[PDB]
């Protein structure tokens, strides 16, 4: 983030079974999976690199990221549900009571 917090985002995304279909397996091809994962990492990088941590949590709460991944991956293969399953803060290099009290 812009406040120099490094963090890992783990996103999960299940494939959409299209209504009015007859075939039982909704398998995406492997190249299609690689394209989906490329668009997923592109979306989460482009929409998590610009904001601070408080705006990132405010976007994580109503799941705007998974909604935009669902909206932008449906030209490659439609996805049943995209969630971000883990956020892990690795290093926080600052202790600042100014922003930490501007939160509270």
């Amino acid at each position: 983030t812009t406040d120099h917090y490094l963090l890992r985002l783990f996103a999960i995304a299940f494939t959409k079974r299209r209504p009015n279909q007859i075939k039982k397996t909704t398998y995406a091809q492997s190249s299609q999976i690689r394209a989906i994962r490329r668009k997923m990492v592109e979306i989460i990088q482009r929409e998590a690199a610009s904001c601070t941590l408080h705006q990132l949590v405010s976007k994580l709460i109503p799941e705007v990221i998974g909604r935009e991944i669902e909206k932008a991956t449906q030209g490659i293969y439609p996805l049943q549900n995209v969630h971000i399953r883990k956020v892990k803060l690795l290093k926080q290099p600052k202790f600042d009571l100014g922003a930490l009290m501007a939160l509270h």
Binding site: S50, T52, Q55, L56, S58, K59, V64, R67, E68
Partner: peptide, 8 residues
């Protein structure tokens, strides 16, 4: 209709 993503 469109989910919020970022408020800065």
């Amino acid at each position: 209709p469109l989910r919020i993503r970022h408020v800065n």
